[PDB]
Amino acid sequence: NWEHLLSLKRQGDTAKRLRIEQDDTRLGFEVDYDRIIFSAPFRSLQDKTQVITDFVHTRLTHSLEVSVVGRSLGRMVGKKLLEKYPHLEQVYGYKFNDFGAIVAAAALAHDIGNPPFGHSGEKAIGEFFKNGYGKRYKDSLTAKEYQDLIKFEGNANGFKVLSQSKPGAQGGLRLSYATLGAFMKYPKESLPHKPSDHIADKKYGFFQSERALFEDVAQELGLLKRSTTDDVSWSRHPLAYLVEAADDICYTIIDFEDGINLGLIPEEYALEYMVKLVGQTIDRNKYNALQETSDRVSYLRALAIGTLINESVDTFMKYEEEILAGTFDQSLIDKSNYQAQITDIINLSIERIYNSREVIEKEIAGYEILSTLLEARCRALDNNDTHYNQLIQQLLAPSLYENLIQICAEVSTMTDGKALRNYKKIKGLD
Amino acid sequence: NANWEHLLSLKRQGDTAKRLRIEQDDTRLGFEVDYDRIIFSAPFRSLQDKTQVITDFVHTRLTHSLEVSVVGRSLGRMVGKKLLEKYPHLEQVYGYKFNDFGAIVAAAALAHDIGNPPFGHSGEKAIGEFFKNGYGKRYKDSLTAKEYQDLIKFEGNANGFKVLSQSKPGAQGGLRLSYATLGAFMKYPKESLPHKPSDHIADKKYGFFQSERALFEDVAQELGLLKRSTTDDVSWSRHPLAYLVEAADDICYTIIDFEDGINLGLIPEEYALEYMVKLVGQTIDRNKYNALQETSDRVSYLRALAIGTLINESVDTFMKYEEEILAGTFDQSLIDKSNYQAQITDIINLSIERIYNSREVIEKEIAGYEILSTLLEARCRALDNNDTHYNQLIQQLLAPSLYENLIQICAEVSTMTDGKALRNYKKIKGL
Ligand SMILES: [Mn+2]
Ligand SMILES: [Mn+2]
Numbered sequence: 001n002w003e004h005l006l007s008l009k010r011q012g013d014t015a016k017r018l019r020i021e022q023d024d025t026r027l028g029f030e031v032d033y034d035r036i037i038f039s040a041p042f043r044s045l046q047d048k049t050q051v052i053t054d055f056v057h058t059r060l061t062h063s064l065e066v067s068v069v070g071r072s073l074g075r076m077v078g079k080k081l082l083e084k085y086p087h088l089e090q091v092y093g094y095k096f097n098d099f100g101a102i103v104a105a106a107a108l109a110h111d112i113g114n115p116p117f118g119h120s121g122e123k124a125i126g127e128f129f130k131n132g133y134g135k136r137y138k139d140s141l142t143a144k145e146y147q148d149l150i151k152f153e154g155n156a157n158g159f160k161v162l163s164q165s166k167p168g169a170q171g172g173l174r175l176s177y178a179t180l181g182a183f184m185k186y187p188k189e190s191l192p193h194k195p196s197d198h199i200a201d202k203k204y205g206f207f208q209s210e211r212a213l214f215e216d217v218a219q220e221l222g223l224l225k226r227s228t229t230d231d232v233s234w235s236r237h238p239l240a241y242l243v244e245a246a247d248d249i250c251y252t253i254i255d256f257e258d259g260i261n262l263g264l265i266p267e268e269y270a271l272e273y274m275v276k277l278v279g280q281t282i283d284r285n286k287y288n289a290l291q292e293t294s295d296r297v298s299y300l301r302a303l304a305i306g307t308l309i310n311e312s313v314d315t316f317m318k319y320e321e322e323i324l325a326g327t328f329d330q331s332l333i334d335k336s337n338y339q340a341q342i343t344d345i346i347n348l349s350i351e352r353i354y355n356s357r358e359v360i361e362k363e364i365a366g367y368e369i370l371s372t373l374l375e376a377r378c379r380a381l382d383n384n385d386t387h388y389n390q391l392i393q394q395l396l397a398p399s400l401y402e403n404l405i406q407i408c409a410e411v412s413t414m415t416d417g418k419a420l421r422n423y424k425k426i427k428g429l430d
Numbered sequence: 431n432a433n434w435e436h437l438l439s440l441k442r443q444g445d446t447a448k449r450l451r452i453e454q455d456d457t458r459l460g461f462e463v464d465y466d467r468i469i470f471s472a473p474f475r476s477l478q479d480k481t482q483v484i485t486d487f488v489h490t491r492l493t494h495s496l497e498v499s500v501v502g503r504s505l506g507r508m509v510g511k512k513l514l515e516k517y518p519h520l521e522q523v524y525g526y527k528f529n530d531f532g533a534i535v536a537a538a539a540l541a542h543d544i545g546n547p548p549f550g551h552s553g554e555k556a557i558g559e560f561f562k563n564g565y566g567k568r569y570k571d572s573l574t575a576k577e578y579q580d581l582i583k584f585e586g587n588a589n590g591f592k593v594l595s596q597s598k599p600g601a602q603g604g605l606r607l608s609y610a611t612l613g614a615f616m617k618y619p620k621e622s623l624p625h626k627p628s629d630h631i632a633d634k635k636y637g638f639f640q641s642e643r644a645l646f647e648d649v650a651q652e653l654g655l656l657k658r659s660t661t662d663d664v665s666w667s668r669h670p671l672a673y674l675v676e677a678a679d680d681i682c683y684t685i686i687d688f689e690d691g692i693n694l695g696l697i698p699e700e701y702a703l704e705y706m707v708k709l710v711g712q713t714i715d716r717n718k719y720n721a722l723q724e725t726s727d728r729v730s731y732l733r734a735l736a737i738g739t740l741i742n743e744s745v746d747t748f749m750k751y752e753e754e755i756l757a758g759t760f761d762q763s764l765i766d767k768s769n770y771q772a773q774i775t776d777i778i779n780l781s782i783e784r785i786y787n788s789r790e791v792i793e794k795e796i797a798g799y800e801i802l803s804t805l806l807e808a809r810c811r812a813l814d815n816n817d818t819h820y821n822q823l824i825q826q827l828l829a830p831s832l833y834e835n836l837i838q839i840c841a842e843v844s845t846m847t848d849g850k851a852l853r854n855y856k857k858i859k860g861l
Binding site: 263268 | 695698
């Protein structure tokens with residue numbers, strides 16, 4: 001039921017929270033958004049770079065733009081869901097802005113747990129425990145606990161960041177269970193690894209240390225079981241599809257916009273790649289009167305995102321029943337009529353942005369930086385008596401699995417600067 | 431009308447007797463020795479640390495000068511062989527050989543950038559701006575109209591001529607290049623005034639400072655260059671070989687600026703074949719081109735071919751208008767008559783839009799104005815009050831007739847490496 005998928009429950013609650021009795025000015029889904037804005041992990045995205053270190057393409061702005069596109073998807077789908085299921089409003093008190101707030105909040109947080117240097121940074125963490133120093137702990141861990149480490153996922157670390165208990169602060173940000181369900185693109189544990197080619201099975205979404213929490217979330221939401229073994233898996237909260245579409249749309253279109261502004265993509269290619277996405281709404285005469293490259297391409301970007309938002313709303317509603325029953329197999333953007341153009345855009349970005357010498361140089365440097373910090377923390381964990389390892393603990397961080405996963409969580413959330421600075425000190429270089 | 435027997439003079443400054451070509455040792459031929467004198471000279475060596483517009487560390491003025499001198503040697507060899515067919519007595523009676531023309535063009539071309547200030551034509555303009563509106567405006571009423579014009583329109587070509595010929599104690603005549611080489615060096619045989627008397631390319635700039643006028647008068651008289659004016663404002667018709675030095679330079683900066691910009695990313699690689707297909711298609715091996723897997727290899731194949739095409743045509747243009755050049759009645763450059771002027775123009779235009787107006791280049795030239803002004807001001811203030819403790823410090827640091835002093839300060843600031851210039855500038859400024 002959509003009634004259960006829209007849970008306002010917060011972790012530790014002993015009583016049901018009913019939608020009809022909420023204060024409109026203090027609606028739990030919108031409180032969630034505010035809690036994220038003011039959280040220290042979201043603020044740290046100011047000093048985190050998406051791919052190009054130009055200092056004006058942060059992960060903060062990306063997260064903001066994804067949440068704006070999310071609220072728009074949530075509002076429009078919300079309005080149509082309330083027309084399809086009128087009891088949801090007339091009896092339970094839901095409003096279309098509710099679905100915008102849930103999608104907006106989970107999208108705002110989607111990037112929050114990811115390590116620096118993108119996918120290279122996840123792979124360096126994993127390689128540290130698969131083949132580097134962290135190999136030694138394998139025999140002291142369960143198969144799923146070790147799999148958390150060798151296949152470290154920033155999505156799962158995001159879930160940990162949002163919900164981690166600390167003294168005086170149990171339950172992290174304590175977001176609504178609907179918001180956490182809309183956050184979880186991959187509602188499975190680290191094993192079994194990729195049991196199918198379903199998008200929800202391409203990674204996993206929570207570490208073992210958050211397993212008990214997501215169990216409580218999935219039971220409250222009423223997510224459909226995808227496993228009846230001790231390897232737990234569930235079908236995605238419907239709104240998670242909208243969070244994913246917001247991110248899909250922004251990375252595809254805005255990465256391209258960035259590449260052109262940066263010079264990595266010749267501006268001559270702008271209209272060729274965008275014409276199908278914008279061709280019926282573009283005011284060509286206004287496009288030609290624009291005098292700056294950055295204005296022409298942001299005009300194209302707004303047209304394309306508009307096109308892809310309207311279509312994604314319509315794809316969600318064409319497949320809503322399948323999504324509610326956990327039988328939908330793809331992403332919304334996979335069903336797009338512009339799939340081929342989207343793929344050409346993404347491939348051009350891989351060729352001209354992600355495989356440029358500057359980006360490659362950053363990732364190679366990232367591997368050493370993270371590998372160094374992980375070894376410094378893990379040796380300090382093994383022999384915490386020596387003077388050097390007392391110092392290492394005071395500089396970076398003032399059960400074995402709980403310890404190792406916390407070290408990954410902490411190295412992962414370090415800003416680009418502090419990582420490079422602490423790495424520089426450990427290696428002596430300035 | 432000029433005579434090829436006098437235009438090929440082996441005279442060096444101060445010579446008391448004539449140098450006949452027949453009497454030369456071919457192992458120590460005057461024109462070839464000119465090339466070595468340049469290679470080994472301090473001003474040429476300093477081009478190692480003098481960057482062009484782009485500072486990739488592998489785009490130097492030494493490489494440009496080298497490649498211009500190579501293309502120049504080819505131009506002069508091929509024209510030289512055709513000139514000896516037309517005028518056989520030059521070999522039968524005077525003993526000239528076609529490699530002589532190759533050597534003259536090659537030595538003049540090699541030296542053509544030797545006197546330019548750093549930072550391009552922006553460097554020249556920073557110096558002029560200094561004397562036109564900066565601290566150096568104060569000298570206007572103590573200089574002649576033409577001494578002041580030398581300064582406010584300071585010209586790297588004219589500074590070049592000074593570098594090659596400047597007398598010093600124990601070194602009369604500078605490098606003492608052959609007069610034929612000095613004649614081919616001089617793309618603009620005129621004084622600083624009058625400014626742009628005509629639209630001829632030879633009238634666009636000027637070629638020698640007042641301090642060097644008497645010197646070029648000697649060169650022009652010996653070569654027998656044709657007097658283009660006798661109004662007390664001296665100018666001559668260009669030595670014919672000067673058109674080839676110019677053509678070699680024109681060819682290289684047109685094609686190799688394009689290549690460089692493609693390699694640096696500033697010009698999409700697609701434009702390479704698009705602007706160059708007319709210039710290469712009669713000579714390109716398509717099979718070879720489509721096998722080359724690296725962009726740098728493809729565009730340098732195209733560049734080698736485009737340059738070959740333009741050398742061959744430039745030789746033809748010279749030989750066609752040879753009699754008009756000898757009469758001083760040829761009004762254009764060799765490249766202005768090329769049948770690829772449409773293609774050359776589009777190349778030059780794209781290079782300007784994507785390279786010369788790129789943000790990196792604009793930035794380097796703006797900082798150059800500040801670096802050159804600061805050095806010129808420290809030098810001129812030290813000249814004006816040599817008595818203060820500071821100006822005596824400045825004198826020990828930067829340099830251990832009023833017009834001669836000012837032009838020498840200009841020559842010295844202009845010939846500084848980018849390293850010494852920036853380091854000395856930073857020192858003056860406390861950085
Ligand atoms: Mn994202
Ligand atoms: Mn040149």
